[PDB]
Amino acid sequence: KMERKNVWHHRKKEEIEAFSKEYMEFMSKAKTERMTVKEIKRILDESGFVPLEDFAGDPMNMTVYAVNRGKAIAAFRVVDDLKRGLNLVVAHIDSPRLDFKPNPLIEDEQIALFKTHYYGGIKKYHWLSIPLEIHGVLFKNDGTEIEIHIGDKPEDPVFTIPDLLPHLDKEDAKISEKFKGENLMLIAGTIPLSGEEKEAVKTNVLKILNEMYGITEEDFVSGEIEVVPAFSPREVGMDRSLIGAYGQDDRICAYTALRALLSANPEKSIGVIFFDKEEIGSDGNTGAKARFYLKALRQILKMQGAKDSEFVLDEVLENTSVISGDVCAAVNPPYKDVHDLHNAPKLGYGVALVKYTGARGKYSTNDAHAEFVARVRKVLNEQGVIWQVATLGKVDQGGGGTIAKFFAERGSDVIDMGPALLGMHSPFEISSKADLFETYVAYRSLMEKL
Amino acid sequence: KMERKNVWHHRKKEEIEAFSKEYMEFMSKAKTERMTVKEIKRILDESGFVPLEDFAGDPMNMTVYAVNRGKAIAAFRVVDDLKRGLNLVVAHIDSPRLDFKPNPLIEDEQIALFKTHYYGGIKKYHWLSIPLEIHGVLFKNDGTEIEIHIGDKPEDPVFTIPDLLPHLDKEDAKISEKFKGENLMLIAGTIPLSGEEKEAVKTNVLKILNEMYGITEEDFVSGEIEVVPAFSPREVGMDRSLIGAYGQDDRICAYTALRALLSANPEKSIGVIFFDKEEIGSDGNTGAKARFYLKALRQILKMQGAKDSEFVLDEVLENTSVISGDVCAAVNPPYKDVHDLHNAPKLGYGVALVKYTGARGKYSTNDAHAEFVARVRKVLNEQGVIWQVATLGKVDQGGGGTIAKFFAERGSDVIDMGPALLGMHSPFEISSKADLFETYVAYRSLMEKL
Amino acid sequence: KMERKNVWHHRKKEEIEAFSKEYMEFMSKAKTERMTVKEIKRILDESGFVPLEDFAGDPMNMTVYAVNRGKAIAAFRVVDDLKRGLNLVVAHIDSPRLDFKPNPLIEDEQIALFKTHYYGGIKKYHWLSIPLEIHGVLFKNDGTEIEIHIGDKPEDPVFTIPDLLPHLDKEDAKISEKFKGENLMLIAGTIPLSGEEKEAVKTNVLKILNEMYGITEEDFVSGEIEVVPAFSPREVGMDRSLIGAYGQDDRICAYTALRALLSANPEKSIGVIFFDKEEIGSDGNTGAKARFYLKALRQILKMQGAKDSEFVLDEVLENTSVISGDVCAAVNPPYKDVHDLHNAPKLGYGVALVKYTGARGKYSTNDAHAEFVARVRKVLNEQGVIWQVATLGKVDQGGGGTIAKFFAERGSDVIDMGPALLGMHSPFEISSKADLFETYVAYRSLMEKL
Amino acid sequence: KMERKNVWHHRKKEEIEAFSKEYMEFMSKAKTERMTVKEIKRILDESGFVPLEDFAGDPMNMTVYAVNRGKAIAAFRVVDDLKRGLNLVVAHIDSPRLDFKPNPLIEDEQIALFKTHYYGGIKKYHWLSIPLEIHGVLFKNDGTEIEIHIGDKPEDPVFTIPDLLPHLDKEDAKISEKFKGENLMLIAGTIPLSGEEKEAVKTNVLKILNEMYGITEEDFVSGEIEVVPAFSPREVGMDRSLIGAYGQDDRICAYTALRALLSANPEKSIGVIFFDKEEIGSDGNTGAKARFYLKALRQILKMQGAKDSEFVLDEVLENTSVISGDVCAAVNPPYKDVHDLHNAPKLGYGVALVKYTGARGKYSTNDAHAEFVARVRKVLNEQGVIWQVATLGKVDQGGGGTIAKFFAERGSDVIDMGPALLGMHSPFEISSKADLFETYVAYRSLMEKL
Ligand SMILES: [Mn+2]
Ligand SMILES: [Mn+2]
Ligand SMILES: [Mn+2]
Ligand SMILES: [Mn+2]
Ligand SMILES: [Mn+2]
Ligand SMILES: [Mn+2]
Ligand SMILES: [Mn+2]
Ligand SMILES: [Mn+2]
């Protein structure tokens, strides 16, 4: 008994392949959280969703969405009274990146550089000597919004933070020292602008930016630009069983959840909420823990006749099951020693059910209740969903931490659930096509029969 | 001339003893938060309490309780308009222990073992070579609930995590290294099944668990089992002045508070709330950071006719005095240099009044206001309660942190109060019978006089 | 070819179980070398034995015994003249423990304390924060003997050596440092006698001790009090195949040898000798090398007509096969590296036959001769006794040393043999019921057939 | 209320003083075991003792002595059937010193030096730059015996091992390094012989030793010379309360015992045995591990008509109480943290009753039984002897180990008793005049009352 089935042996190859190409197409547009919101919203508009604010026409049946500030977005399919509660799948759309500084442009030794400040649990050495592209937006003083996208197009140049050749790198310190956040600067120019006696190369770059976007240097301050890997999603492996791409840290869950939401046949209200800032603690007004979430829900309660928002919300949240959809780590052979094999997920064996994460003895982590796990286990088994238990490394390996805790905090039962990755947080995260497909299945089954 | 008074010299040996036996009897039942709740409930059911969800009586005079998820519980004796506030004593009913992994059963070197994942700030070396009890619940796929209690009965076997004999335990690492969470596995069985050629021993335990609970290996995933010391409460010392027992960390405060709640003659509404998860940060929907707390008060308010829950709450919490009932550290002679003797509690000298905890200089902790302490100082003195001021060690020694900050965060004045233990977080914590009693006396008078 | 059999597959579950209940009854009586001698003495008395000191019958068929100083005891069943030598199995009845110092009572920080001095190879951290009980004897200045047994009964208070709470335990030292033998003091009392200007608590404890035993502080000098863990023997495991108890380190070999002595049907004289002082190197009056052993044999020889004691003895010992009892170490999965699996004993695979108890290349050990092992191997095999070979860990892992050498030194052939333990020297040692039984089965065979 | 009594307040200053001068006079003679024996003999010859080999008197009333090899001696006052046992006090007459190598004379940098090989646990740095005496015997090939005593007479020169002046003694190593045995060489001479062209200085010393003792260089091989401090016994302190002297380590016990043997009025046979070699393990035919001890008793037994020596011995040793007379360590104020003040002896507070020594928890040491201590406690108290309990430092501090275990090994009950020194093993050990006296008083009463 107690054996894990391999998805490739219980699901249609063609179905997996198809769903796989749709995912990667999406991962081609979703490099930042602003692009993911944009890309999700249009998929919603395309599927007949309308802004919750603009909705008119009977609650008890309304498919709407609420965009936070371009950084977060919540989509619901209200099918009944919210006091009946709902099935939610929460995920995050921010991934480790680089981020320009308020004053990014500088020149050092006749070379224009863009200074950055890493974001999230990055691994410095991953971002040295690889083709990067930049995305983001800048506002002119008058308030004109300027979008930037350089590197995603073949006629576009890419950027780079060149490593030091090994011939003159005569000094090996701990991975800690060596690789300083400050030296993560993209080369921006090198060509001096004839006639300038002070920082000719920097000036020239500003000249190009001004002729190209009508922007001036002070416009970087009132703007945000993210540096990401130019690698495009690709199939991986001789058997083409895996997917390689940047930002799979939850965009893989966001995508699957989105899809599950669009094909589900609910019984009670359902929805998905994609948050930002999770990679740095979920602070700010666009991450989990922000009033945003309960505000969207309160808005609905009023349209449904709720007299006392907060009181009614108590039942809404009392009922309502939340699936914290985030990723975990798959046993990586050369480093199998970091896991407890009897509780570590394997690529291809299905969605991982992660009861508790955290660190040093379940510190600051949400631990799902046996009653909830039971209810989740029953729906999955009845729907023939293929899943596997998943722990975040041997007892004291570390890591741990999702957004699930911020939801149990509001009174709802939550459980972490998603596919296992390889090389998480790197510029090219690996995932299994089959698991990617089964997560979608799982989320849909839970949204429906939970 | 300010000096501390010894409770034994001011309270009647026979009343302390009676209270001790009642406490120890309670402690023989409350070994986990689930068992504690169930035990606190039957005591509440007697005494005449009814669920808040099934009240239907006079909203101005109700003695009710709310059970979160079998892991937390709130009990109030509402005898006025809650707008006038409550007098609440709060504590936690969870203690450092060992939890079974989702997949706990494995076999190694022909021996069945149950893997664990320690919960809370335990001292790993305490759990090696001591009798252990298994407690918890398992859910079979169909939904069936199965309670497990093994080792707490004379006709029951116990479990152990045998340490390595000193003869081959060469090489002495720091306490950090040595003693690794991963190695905290209980021996499940050693007898192999006849005919079985693959894990004959693990197969046997499964055969046994099945002929006993009708469960299969996978039921552990949708289960929550906790390992606890087989030690039962006992008197300690030649003068029988102390109590040795597992989980005194707050269940001692929970008991004294519960008792004070039942004995009190309150002028205003009083109540006690017992939380889960504090030993890991209070995260989770059963922690003192979850909606549950304010959910219950809002519930009571509507029954009293509140029209705008939130607004009415601002006042309820504005008034209302919360007593954070948690234990502090008494001076352990051999390690007395860890304390500031002029600000450290002593066994037998009364309840400890703990103004602020935290570390490195009041970091992340509630620091009682001088005026709130003043009100407390006056009640205790007026009723002749034996108390003493306590601190959690010398300035930069260690780090405390109770749930007090979670209620102060909600607008109420809060202070930490409880008995002083010796060997906190170990399998056999020590407390003073005299302090036990006086804590109850303190909680009751504060409930009635604040 | 060549494979160990599991005793559970070749022995009646009813026999093993019953013999186990009896051994456990015994272990709840033998917690110190004195109580063990006392216990063994009555089992002998009830079985027909009488003191060698006052035997009268035929010196060719005598079943006597000789207690040394209430700490050691030799029991023989002379069935022929000792010149034919006899078959003996020797074990030790002392176990690592804590001893009260001559002046054990002191007070510090208003806490009565009992200073100890550990005995044998204990792991100091094992004794912190666990229930303890004291057993021993004190003599008044007039010669009166006072027995002390506090903690072995429920009504009795138990003692403890509270560890420091993790919160304030800062310095991360290595096992060597930290856990100072000096800090292993039991808490004596905390209540202060009113009216006492100095050391009020200590006076109260002496006041309690004097009303209970009429003793005075000086009576501890002419006394011997041992500190033993409070917990009693319990079955262990889901399959209940193991036994957990303090002092299994040879009280187990002594018990099985005893029972084997009573039910054996000898062909030549046989006997069992239980020694003291083994955990410290067998020094003193009651040790394995304390003259007591040969004094008993000479006595018996003289009762048989021995003219030149020492000369005759030369032959008595020339013949005479000695089986050194004592336990060995089983493989503890998480620490299996410590062992050479091909030469290490497994729990439940029979009596361990240890040829030598090395230490860095067999220093100071009794390596049994091939021809003597062959003799033993023939008997065990022919009698169908299940056994396995066992070495005390990998080559330079650690030390070892049974009393066997003290007997080979006297001219006899010796060989180490007993069951395999887990967590040796801890307060809760683990052993297999099956092995417990086969050791008894093995001793009985060898006595009857060597 | 238990408290120690100060001998100076209970024994008569004039009797202590008289005893002190007699002791110090003895100590001026006994500087080595060979000199001590010779000195103990003439005192025994007076007082009326005769060699055991030349007795020929009443076997039931003999006061004899046995000299081992001029290095050990036994003296008994047999006044009954030895079967009734003896009351023996044992001590050693050897002390830490420096021995001449077999070939001790060498020359280096034009200076004759005598190489040495330290004996016993000395502190090398004590022997640098202090006056030294040379004592011992040399045998010329023909067999002639030549006693050497140089430095103990005013008209004698002394020797020295000059340390390096601090000015060039750069580099500070641990006490281990620095101070090397090999470098403990006494300056023999510095004057060169006229005409000599090879080692003119070593040649001179040889010429001198020859015109003085008629010896040649090779006679040192068949010789045994010991280097000893030139310091002579002296009163110490303003109150003249102490005694400073070399070799107090036991010669203080040997003296007090000898004196008690001569003063006593015994009920049963009493005696004292003085051993050699204890300072290195008691190995050798003059140590307390050699046949000598039992050889003498067997001798006495035959004279009493014993037919079977060994058998009769079992009883002799069965009865017979042995007092291990050796010194313990008094608290040295500046280094008082090395002791457990509640169990450490103090100068002037009587003989120390030392139950067990050894290290790491009673390893390799005799641990007196409670009943034996009881008998001792009673005699001392009954005769009003001032005594105190002593321990050799805190639990894991150091390591003791007296010859007590060698007699307990032979069947007799044994306990350690002696005065408390300060600076043991140094060239000038300190003892208390009051303790000196009281030791003698204790030994005598025990001899007469046990
Ligand atoms: Mn991440
Ligand atoms: Mn994530
Ligand atoms: Mn705690
Ligand atoms: Mn607590
Ligand atoms: Mn042992
Ligand atoms: Mn042993
Ligand atoms: Mn010495
Ligand atoms: Mn000595």
Coordinates of N, CA and C in Angstrom, one line a residue, chain C residues 353-400:
Chain C
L353 N 27.0 -13.0 21.6 CA 28.2 -13.8 22.0 C 29.3 -12.8 21.7
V354 N 29.9 -12.2 22.7 CA 31.0 -11.2 22.5 C 32.3 -11.9 22.8
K355 N 33.2 -12.0 21.8 CA 34.5 -12.7 22.0 C 35.5 -11.8 22.8
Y356 N 35.4 -10.5 22.5 CA 36.3 -9.6 23.2 C 35.7 -8.2 23.3
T357 N 36.0 -7.5 24.4 CA 35.5 -6.1 24.6 C 36.7 -5.2 24.5
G358 N 37.1 -5.0 23.2 CA 38.2 -4.1 22.9 C 38.3 -2.7 23.5
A359 N 39.1 -1.9 22.8 CA 39.4 -0.5 23.1 C 40.7 -0.3 22.4
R360 N 40.7 0.5 21.3 CA 41.9 0.8 20.5 C 42.8 -0.4 20.3
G361 N 42.3 -1.5 19.8 CA 43.2 -2.6 19.5 C 43.2 -3.7 20.6
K362 N 42.1 -3.9 21.3 CA 42.0 -5.0 22.3 C 42.8 -4.7 23.5
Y363 N 42.9 -3.5 24.0 CA 43.7 -3.3 25.2 C 42.9 -3.6 26.5
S364 N 43.5 -4.3 27.4 CA 42.9 -4.6 28.7 C 41.6 -5.3 28.6
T365 N 41.6 -6.3 27.8 CA 40.3 -7.1 27.6 C 40.6 -8.6 27.8
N366 N 39.5 -9.4 27.8 CA 39.6 -10.8 27.9 C 39.1 -11.4 26.5
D367 N 40.0 -11.7 25.7 CA 39.7 -12.2 24.4 C 39.6 -13.7 24.6
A368 N 38.4 -14.3 24.4 CA 38.1 -15.7 24.6 C 38.9 -16.5 23.6
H369 N 39.3 -17.7 24.0 CA 40.1 -18.6 23.2 C 39.1 -19.3 22.2
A370 N 39.7 -19.6 21.0 CA 38.9 -20.2 20.0 C 38.3 -21.5 20.5
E371 N 39.1 -22.3 21.2 CA 38.6 -23.6 21.7 C 37.5 -23.5 22.7
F372 N 37.5 -22.4 23.5 CA 36.4 -22.2 24.5 C 35.2 -21.6 23.8
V373 N 35.3 -20.8 22.8 CA 34.2 -20.3 22.0 C 33.6 -21.5 21.3
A374 N 34.4 -22.4 20.8 CA 34.0 -23.6 20.1 C 33.1 -24.5 21.0
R375 N 33.5 -24.6 22.3 CA 32.8 -25.3 23.2 C 31.4 -24.7 23.5
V376 N 31.4 -23.4 23.6 CA 30.1 -22.7 23.8 C 29.2 -22.8 22.6
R377 N 29.9 -22.6 21.4 CA 29.1 -22.7 20.2 C 28.5 -24.0 19.9
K378 N 29.1 -25.1 20.4 CA 28.6 -26.4 20.3 C 27.4 -26.6 21.1
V379 N 27.4 -26.1 22.4 CA 26.3 -26.3 23.3 C 25.1 -25.4 22.8
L380 N 25.3 -24.1 22.6 CA 24.2 -23.3 22.1 C 23.6 -23.9 20.8
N381 N 24.4 -24.2 19.8 CA 23.9 -24.8 18.6 C 23.1 -26.1 18.8
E382 N 23.7 -27.0 19.5 CA 23.1 -28.3 19.8 C 21.8 -28.2 20.6
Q383 N 21.7 -27.2 21.5 CA 20.5 -27.0 22.3 C 19.5 -26.1 21.6
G384 N 19.9 -25.8 20.3 CA 19.0 -25.0 19.5 C 18.8 -23.5 20.1
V385 N 19.8 -23.0 20.7 CA 19.7 -21.6 21.2 C 20.0 -20.6 20.1
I386 N 19.2 -19.6 20.0 CA 19.4 -18.6 19.0 C 20.4 -17.5 19.5
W387 N 21.5 -17.3 18.8 CA 22.5 -16.4 19.2 C 23.1 -15.6 18.0
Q388 N 23.9 -14.6 18.3 CA 24.5 -13.8 17.2 C 25.8 -13.2 17.8
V389 N 26.8 -13.0 17.0 CA 28.1 -12.4 17.4 C 27.9 -10.9 17.6
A390 N 28.7 -10.3 18.5 CA 28.7 -8.9 18.7 C 30.0 -8.3 19.1
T391 N 30.4 -7.2 18.4 CA 31.6 -6.5 18.8 C 31.2 -5.2 19.3
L392 N 31.9 -4.6 20.2 CA 31.6 -3.3 20.8 C 31.9 -2.1 19.9
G393 N 31.2 -2.0 18.8 CA 31.5 -0.9 17.9 C 32.7 -1.1 16.9
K394 N 32.9 -0.2 16.0 CA 34.0 -0.2 15.0 C 35.3 -0.2 15.8
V395 N 36.3 -0.7 15.1 CA 37.7 -0.8 15.7 C 38.2 0.2 16.7
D396 N 38.3 1.5 16.4 CA 38.7 2.5 17.3 C 37.6 3.4 17.9
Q397 N 36.4 3.0 17.8 CA 35.2 3.7 18.3 C 35.2 4.1 19.7
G398 N 35.2 3.1 20.6 CA 35.2 3.4 22.0 C 35.7 2.3 22.9
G399 N 35.6 2.5 24.2 CA 36.1 1.5 25.2 C 35.1 0.4 25.5
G400 N 35.5 -0.5 26.4 CA 34.7 -1.6 26.8 C 35.5 -2.3 27.9

